[PDB]
Amino acid sequence: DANLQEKKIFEEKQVSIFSHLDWRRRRTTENIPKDIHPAVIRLGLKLANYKIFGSNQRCIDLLKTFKIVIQDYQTPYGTTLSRHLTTHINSQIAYLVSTRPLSISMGNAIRFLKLEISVLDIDLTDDEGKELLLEKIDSYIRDRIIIAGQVIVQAATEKIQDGDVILTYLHSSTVNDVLIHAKNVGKKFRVVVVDSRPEFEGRVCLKLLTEHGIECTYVMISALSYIMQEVTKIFLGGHAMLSNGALYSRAGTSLISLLGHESNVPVIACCESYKFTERIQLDSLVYNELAPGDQLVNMGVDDFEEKPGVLANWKSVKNLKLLSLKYDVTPPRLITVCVCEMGLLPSTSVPAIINEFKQV
Amino acid sequence: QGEFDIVQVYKKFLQDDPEITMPVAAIEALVQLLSRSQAKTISEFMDILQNGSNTLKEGVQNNISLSAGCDIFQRFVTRSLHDVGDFEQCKRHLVENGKLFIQRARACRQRIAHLGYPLIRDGSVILTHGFSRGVAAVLLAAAKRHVRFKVFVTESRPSGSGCLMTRTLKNACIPTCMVLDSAVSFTMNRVDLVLVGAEGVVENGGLINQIGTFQLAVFAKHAHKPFYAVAESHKFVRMFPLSQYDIPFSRPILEFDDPSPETVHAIHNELIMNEEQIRNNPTLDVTPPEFVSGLITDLGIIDSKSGVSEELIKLYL
Amino acid sequence: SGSGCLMTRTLKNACIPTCMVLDSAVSFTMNRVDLVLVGAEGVVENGGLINQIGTFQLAVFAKHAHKPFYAVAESHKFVRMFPLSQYDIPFSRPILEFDDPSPETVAIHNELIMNEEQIRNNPTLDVTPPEFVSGLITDLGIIDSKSGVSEELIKLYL
Amino acid sequence: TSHCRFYENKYPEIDDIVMVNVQQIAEMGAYVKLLEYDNIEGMILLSELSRRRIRSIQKLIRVGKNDVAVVLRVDKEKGYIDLSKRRVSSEDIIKCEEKYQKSKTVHSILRYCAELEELYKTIAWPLSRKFGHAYEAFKLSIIDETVWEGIEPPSKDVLDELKNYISKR
């Protein structure tokens, strides 16, 4: 299997610049192993079939699920809790990975949870070790995610000015909670909502903001040059901020930033701290994540419907292959500020904050 | 009596010494306001200097460097502050550490010069904007080390401090040549270095200074000549201007007339904007960090413009 | 030249709002402006723009602010000269010289300006290279190629 | 008389431990208000405030809830009170909150019947001056009658009603 697969996954290093991007996905429970707790499976499906799954909500639901795993965990009393528990968890991510690659919001959370495993004292009994971890997780959720959000929402709202007209793109539940919280404090402004194919993630940001009574405009990304003339500020919620200062978010996030800079409007990046990473990318192709190309076949303005595209045979047509990345890397010189719970920082100041936490 | 309007003490030190700037004055004033005070509770102490600072802050037209210096001063005192056993230790640790800040503060302008003058090289050509005691010290410290160089000077409208900075250098027998604000570009090819003062340093490593600062920075960029700005640490402010424009406006700025039908029917140095419409013009510009080759402070010379924040965050406890 | 105090009047006498901005404050002004427009005292083989001392000062800001830069020039101002840099122009008076001293000790401050002697040391004119001008307004039409300025210029001098 | 303090002490002595709800945070401290004394002012220094693990902390999670702190100094002639939490004994923390709600419980009783300040003179404080605390024996008041040894309310006009409200146990 993996012995033979590792050669396969390496033989995919050839001409196509996307040859290295892993495409393998487990979307069903066929031939599923047994080491897999139910609540993990229900998440594995949600990871592969949901499409409006915020990078935060995943790390939340992941950890909450991990709680139930550790709670329902029964350590072999021929050993102790510490040994043979990460090994149990490790066999859960391998499934959870095969249903969709790990985000950055998740890996760092996993990378953290594995540490507190390795450090707790053996004097504690298993029922003591559990109740300890459950606290550390619940704290990790409130301190690093929720509260951090509530800080960012406030700090970001400060730089909102009456008369603004700001631009979001593709539903970042963080940047929604800002705009939402922006109207409640009475800031006078309006919003531009940039959407794009294939899964129009924008028209749910339009739904939310409209259901809160916010003036909004809706245009596809190909209308950026036409609509940027109105915009005054740009707000972006990222999937992660790299250590060079770059913003690792979804597709058009670069063109949003680029076009804005070439119109003197600022690119404000809202992203929690735990999404930071020591990783660093020079192009939006080294590290990325694929999406099904068939989702491009659908012509009209709907996802799953009755649009027999003229490309529905691309899997069988020679020399014709569709693809759709779903994250891209935007250089710093377009991002003007990163608003993290440590305050408004210059994007390039990321690795310091990383090394801040690493003192433990 | 007791503690009179400390603005007097503030104003006195300006006359007791004109060669010290506005920030270092209030710090010299508060320590007195801390010294000539008996509060008996830590609350009263900080309740005073807050009202003490804000009064000073409300005194001067909300000067940045001052409003900067004071806020830094507070957080230094209340940082390592702790109440243990007796109480006089409080007032002791305050004024003692408070005295230390000033000692560290007034000596900043010296550290800068000792680090700045090697930028000036034999036969080099320097360009500065307006008057700035920081630029003065380094340039003087150059000549006192006996190096040959010439400097340009900007007319620095509306402050007009170019004439003053022109003098302050000539009296140290170094050449001068005043360039009026509308002709800095024409000279950049002739320069090898660009030096300038700083009235305020912000979180993105920005540069708040007189109205013409950013004017020079872009020219230096387009002419591939470096840009150096002298700033004292106690000018670091906890504000983040988005664009190169969002800064607080004491006045309203740059408005237009509403001319209804009323007909009212090459050196011309007398043709000048009146004092009324000059007040319509701004006074400060902000230079983004991308245009600063290096920030020189008592903390050292800072090129990162990401460590500017780290150093700043080190200040506000 | 101080001609700013005059131009604002010439507009106001036609019901046009005016806000005089210091020479040192065009940068702060840009993000407000939608388009900058200037005259020309002379047009150059390279499509350059010899005009008053401050044109290139704000011709670069327009570039940095991505706002279009337009200049008006009459055909009888196309001159047959060619500067290599924004300084290669003939000087009537030697400009921008330095004083040679010797050990001799000797807000708003509108009355603090350079003397009429210092000003005469400063240059009168300024040249903006053609990459900074979006277009040229002439009786020959609106010219923008900055190689078509030469064809037309060559069409003249013959 | 619509709101009165909890204990006889108009102000708490030093080394006392008191529940307090945070009001706001400033450049110099945390303005608070002590519930057991009609929410009078009070300030907590940043350094004496609970330790942190952020560059410049902004987790104003505590900015609304009620926390527990010790007393450091008191100036009864101006209102200033200096407090601290970092020094609060981790176990003696709950003893405040444990001994809090009972006081909160008692105040809930009167406020109902007080729609006050004089009633604490009548029954409360002297009873807490009699036994250890108004709660340690208030359950006995419904099982005993020697409790009122030396009790002089304004009258039994509402005390009798209050006797019927000792029932909620």
Curated annotation (Swiss-Prot), chain A:
The effect of residue 143 to K is: Increases guanyl-nucleotide exchange factor activity on eIF2
Q: Does the keyword Phosphoprotein apply?
A: yes
Keyword line? Cytoplasm, Initiation factor, Phosphoprotein, Protein biosynthesis
Q: Name any GO cellular component annotation.
A: cytosol
Q: Which GO terms describe its biological process?
A: cytoplasmic translational initiation
What residue intervals traverse the membrane? Answer: none
- Write out the annotated subcellular location: Cytoplasm, Cytosol
> Per UniProt, what is one GO molecular function of this protein?
translation initiation factor activity
Q: Which domain of life is it from?
A: Eukaryota
Q: What does this protein do?
A: Acts as a component of the translation initiation factor 2B (eIF2B) complex, which catalyzes the exchange of GDP for GTP on the eukaryotic initiation factor 2 (eIF2) complex gamma subunit. Its guanine nucleotide exchange factor activity is repressed when bound to eIF2 complex phosphorylated on the alpha subunit, thereby limiting the amount of methionyl-initiator methionine tRNA available to the ribosome and consequently global translation is repressed.
Similarity section: Belongs to the eIF-2B alpha/beta/delta subunits family.
Q: Tell me the subunit arrangement.
A: Component of the translation initiation factor 2B (eIF2B) complex which is a heterodecamer of two sets of five different subunits: alpha, beta, gamma, delta and epsilon. Subunits alpha, beta and delta comprise a regulatory subcomplex and subunits epsilon and gamma comprise a catalytic subcomplex. Within the complex, the hexameric regulatory complex resides at the center, with the two heterodimeric catalytic subcomplexes bound on opposite sides.
Q: What is this protein called?
A: Translation initiation factor eIF2B subunit delta
Q: Which organism is it from?
A: Schizosaccharomyces pombe (strain 972 / ATCC 24843) (Fission yeast)
Q: What is the lineage of its organism?
A: Eukaryota, Fungi, Dikarya, Ascomycota, Taphrinomycotina
Provide the gene name from the record.
tif224
Full-protein positions shown = 106 to 465 of 467
UniProtKB/Swiss-Prot annotation, chain C:
In the UniProt annotation, what is the result of changing residue 26 to F? Decreases the amount of gcn3 in the eIF2B complex
List the range of the whole protein covered here. Answer: 172 to 341 of 341
The UniProt-reported impact of residue 82 to V is:
Decreases the amount of gcn3 in the eIF2B complex
Assembly information from the UniProt record: Component of the translation initiation factor 2B (eIF2B) complex which is a heterodecamer of two sets of five different subunits: alpha, beta, gamma, delta and epsilon. Subunits alpha, beta and delta comprise a regulatory subcomplex and subunits epsilon and gamma comprise a catalytic subcomplex. Within the complex, the hexameric regulatory complex resides at the center, with the two heterodimeric catalytic subcomplexes bound on opposite sides.
This protein's encoding gene = gcn3
Where does the record say this protein resides?
A: Cytoplasm, Cytosol
Q: What does this protein do?
A: Acts as a component of the translation initiation factor 2B (eIF2B) complex, which catalyzes the exchange of GDP for GTP on the eukaryotic initiation factor 2 (eIF2) complex gamma subunit. Its guanine nucleotide exchange factor activity is repressed when bound to eIF2 complex phosphorylated on the alpha subunit, thereby limiting the amount of methionyl-initiator methionine tRNA available to the ribosome and consequently global translation is repressed.
Protein name (record): Translation initiation factor eIF2B subunit alpha
For this chain, the family text in UniProt reads: Belongs to the eIF-2B alpha/beta/delta subunits family.
Curated annotation (Swiss-Prot), chain D:
Q: How is it modified after translation?
A: Phosphorylated; phosphorylation on Ser-50 by the GCN2 protein kinase occurs in response to low amino acid, carbon, or purine availability. Phosphorylation inhibits the guanine nucleotide exchange factor activity of the eIF2B complex.
Domain S1 motif, residue spans: 15-86
Q: What is the effect of changing residue 50 to D?
A: Weakly impairs derepression of GCN4 expression in amino acid-starved cells
Phosphoserine PTM sites in chain numbering: 50
Is rRNA-binding one of the keywords UniProt gives this record? Answer: no
In the record, biological process GO terms are: formation of translation preinitiation complex; translational initiation
Q: Which GO terms describe its molecular function?
A: ribosome binding; RNA binding; translation initiation factor activity
Q: Report the GO terms under cellular component.
A: cytoplasm; cytoplasmic stress granule; cytosol; eukaryotic 48S preinitiation complex; eukaryotic translation initiation factor 2 complex; multi-eIF complex; ribosome
Per the UniProt entry, the effect of residue 85 to A is: Alters the binding mode to the eIF2B complex
Location relative to the cell: Cytoplasm, Cytosol
Keywords tagged on the record: Cytoplasm, Initiation factor, Phosphoprotein, Protein biosynthesis, RNA-binding
Question: What is noted besides the main data?
Answer: Present with 17100 molecules/cell in log phase SD medium.
Entry similarity comment: Belongs to the eIF-2-alpha family.
Role description: eIF-2 functions in the early steps of protein synthesis by forming a ternary complex with GTP and initiator tRNA. This complex binds to a 40S ribosomal subunit, followed by mRNA binding to form a 43S pre-initiation complex. Junction of the 60S ribosomal subunit to form the 80S initiation complex is preceded by hydrolysis of the GTP bound to eIF-2 and release of an eIF-2-GDP binary complex. In order for eIF-2 to recycle and catalyze another round of initiation, the GDP bound to eIF-2 must exchange with GTP by way of a reaction catalyzed by eIF2B.
User: What is this protein called in UniProt?
Assistant: Eukaryotic translation initiation factor 2 subunit alpha
Question: What organism is recorded for this protein?
Answer: Saccharomyces cerevisiae (strain ATCC 204508 / S288c)
* Gene that specifies this protein: SUI2
Q: Which residues of the full protein are shown?
A: 3 to 176 of 304
